[model samples]
Target: MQRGIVWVVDDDSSIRWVLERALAGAGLTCTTFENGNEVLAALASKTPDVLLSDIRMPGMDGLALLKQIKQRHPMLPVIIMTAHSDLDAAVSAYQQGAFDYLPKPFDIDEAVALVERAISHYQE
Candidate 1:
């Protein structure tokens, strides 16, 4: 079996590309989207084991997407990423049911660890 399935949503192409390679390197399945619209559309057919999303995007920002995801799939774990490091957004992310909040320029290993742990949390 695969380690886990992970969905990454970010406007930054580099971030998405980096995570795709990193998660795959760690033996997890990974999918990427440039914005929440794609993710929501994909969710219509399936859900990933975990989701990592950036807070600021041109359309359908992370927190709004998080609320929608929580409504549809309350159990799915979502890790929200942001460059702002805004306490309000961090608190709001948690309030809206984010599994965790990650600041930008984060360690790749830590991101992988968080994804694994989020999957493990649901598995157990």
Candidate 2:
């Protein structure tokens, strides 16, 4: 059986690159998008086991994107990633039904562990 697929949405190429590498190295399938629209377009065809998205972006910020995603895919777990310390956004994300939030400068192992645990929870 297939393990899991992780979708990441981030405007920064560097973050995307690092995440893709981390996820791939950990043996999880990974897909990435530069913006919410990119992820939205792909979602029409497939859904990821987990989603990691940035809070601030040029178009369709994380919370707005999360709102739309929840409307359609309510059960899909979403992890919001904030650059530094946007605690309000973090709180809002939690209140609005986020799976988790990743603060900036995260430890690689912990992030991967959280992703696996989330998918495992879903499988349960």
Candidate 3:
């Protein structure tokens, strides 16, 4: 089995830092991107086991990025994070092939759990 790697795309430095540290602590290798474009660029050479990205961003929002990734790397699992309270957008993301959705101000434990689950599922 391929060793698991988690790719995180978020404009917020704090979020990226948190995720990087959290994923590393969980024994998963992680790579972080400040934007979707960077993530896509990196994917040209490498692809991670799972992608975790923020829904709203200045350029190439997560939804569009997710669609692009799906087209190019359909088997790669993606998870979308949003601050919006409405489930409509989250559901839409899921429908668009996101493996999961996470709301902002999330519990760290829950985030870790979800990511771990995704990584485990991918490994299996």
Candidate 4:
């Protein structure tokens, strides 16, 4: 998935920083946002190969965003994440068709693999 575009959306700066750098090192392009609304706005202009979004945010939670994305861009791969051990949210994410999930306190290497695999196996 070299040079693939991966969109990283999270309110946490550290998550964005690590993901941006990791995807860059893995030779994939990346775009980051602090909230889902920003990314939803971006869809008017561009699209990405994959999206990694945090489940909880100040507004427009990831599942809510995922619903919109699935409606408008059903084929896009979106990886949802959350630090809380909320199994129901995780279940709802899958039911809503999230491509994957990355729990917090993640393994960077595994994150790289997840992103690579998601893009490599992806289609629009």
Candidate 5:
């Protein structure tokens, strides 16, 4: 976890900022993007140990992105975050094979903890 990078994709800058800061605080390197498309494009170059993405966005939603990501990188751990109390979306995320789910306004500590766990899982 300490040596691997975490990728965060969210539409909100504040959400990305807080997550980036929290992950860095946990001694993890973090990279972020505003939408899922950017993340997909970046995937061509490299990938992260753990990927945290928001459920809903303007273009290319997280679940859709997760589907594509899984097709390309089945072993990568992808954590999905939903800003609203959308149970269906959360369930869909799991159905799409998400590694975990986070509900906003999530605890920073918990988020960081999950990211660490994801990194470990990826390594395993």
Candidate 6:
């Protein structure tokens, strides 16, 4: 069987690079997109085992993306990342079917663990 892959969508190249490294270290393959539209296009061909995305972006922000994913691929687990201290956005994401939310400047270990947990939860 193929090892599960994580789809990471973030406009910031730095965050994408960091997440790729972090997830790769945890034995998960990662494919990154600069924006949600790219990811949406990619999804036409294949779906990732899990999704990690940033909330704010130039276009098609994370919340909208979450809604789209939930509509098209309801079974895929999506985790949203936000820098805003307020939990309102996180709550909204959860209501929209996001699997989890990670605050900005999150510990890499915590992110890795959460991704692993989401993947395991889906597998079981």
lDDT-better candidate, 3 vs 4: 4
Q: In candidate 4, what are the lDDT values of residues 1-124, reduced to their tens digit? A: 5566767777778868878888787777777877677777886466777677776643334455566555545676666566646324655555545544666668755777777777877753
In model 6, which runs have C-alpha deviations exceeding 4 angstroms?
A: 58-62, 85-87, 93-98
Native RMSD of candidate 1 (Å): 2.6
Ranking by lDDT: 1, 6, 5, 2, 4, 3
Tens-digit lDDT string for candidate 6 (1-124) = 2355777777778878878887787777788887678778887677788777776543334465566666556777766677755235555545544455676668756887787787888776
Predicted candidate 1 versus true structure: per-residue lDDT over 1-124, tens digit per residue? 3898777877778878778888888878788987677878887677778777776643334465566565555677766676655324655545544455666678766888788888888876
Highest lDDT among the candidates is held by which one? Answer: 1
Judged by lDDT against the true structure, how good is candidate 6? 0.69
> In model 5, which regions exceed 4 Å deviation?
58-62, 93-98
For model 4, where is the 10-residue window of minimal lDDT? 56-65
Off by over 4 Å in 3: 1-3, 58-62, 93-98
Q: Which ten residues in a row have the lowest lDDT in candidate 6?
A: 56-65
- C-alpha RMSD values across all candidates: 2.6, 2.6, 3.2, 2.9, 2.8, 2.8
- Better candidate number, 2 or 6, judged by lDDT: 6
Candidate 1, residue 95: how far the Cα is off, in Å: 4.7
| TM-score-best of 2 and 5 | 2
RMSD in Å for model 6: 2.8
Compose the digit string of candidate 2's lDDT tens values, residues 1-124.
Answer: 2456667777778767777787777777677887678778787666778777776653334465666556545677666576555435655644445555777668655676778788888865
Task: Please give the CA lDDT of all the candidate structures.
Answer: 0.70, 0.68, 0.66, 0.66, 0.68, 0.69
- What range of 10 consecutive residues in model 1 has the weakest lDDT sum? 56-65
